Swiss-Prot record:
It is found in: Cytoplasm; Cell membrane, Sarcolemma; Cell membrane, Sarcolemma, T-tubule. The gene is STAC3. Residues 6-65, 66-123 form the SH3 domain. The chain holds residues 245 to 364 of 364 of the full protein. It comes from the Eukaryota. This is SH3 and cysteine-rich domain-containing protein 3. It is linked to Congenital myopathy 13: An autosomal recessive disease characterized by congenital weakness and arthrogryposis, cleft palate, ptosis, short stature, kyphoscoliosis, talipes deformities, and susceptibility to malignant hyperthermia provoked by anesthesia. Disulfide bonds: none annotated.
Length: 123
């Protein structure tokens, strides 16, 4: 809104979170989340449209404006020493480089590496 400050980043869900309580933020992998309270280490408050609630912070990944987000469509074991990464189908990742050689650099939230573009879909 115009009352809030302009935002150059957001977050995307990495996993399914099932609400424990009426005020937990239900979400599926890939949904865009605006974090409105991250002052508590173990439980953040976020919004998905008009939905608002609490959720575990390790269930989301940070995305900068202009970064592309993908879902893995095919599990694939990468050659780690040359910079590739192993990912499983339905995993959510953030793009961190330009495509080259049929691979693109992505971030899982804990590891970085090259993954085949044919085994990703944009979300
Ligand atoms: Na920002």
């Amino acid at each position: 809104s115009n009352a809030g400050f302009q935002q150059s980043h957001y977050f995307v869900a990495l996993y399914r979170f099932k609400a424990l309580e009426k005020d937990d933020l239900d979400f599926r992998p890939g949904e865009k989340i605006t974090v409105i309270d991250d002052s508590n280490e173990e439980s953040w408050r976020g919004k998905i449209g008009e939905k608002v609630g609490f959720f575990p912070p390790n269930f989301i990944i940070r995305v900068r404006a202009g970064e592309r987000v993908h879902r893995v469509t095919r599990s694939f074991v990468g050659n780690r020493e040359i910079g590739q990464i192993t990912l499983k189908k339905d995993q959510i990742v953030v793009q961190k480089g330009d495509e080259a050689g049929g691979y693109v650099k992505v971030y899982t939230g804990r590891k970085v590496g090259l993954f085949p573009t044919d085994f990703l879909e944009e979300i």
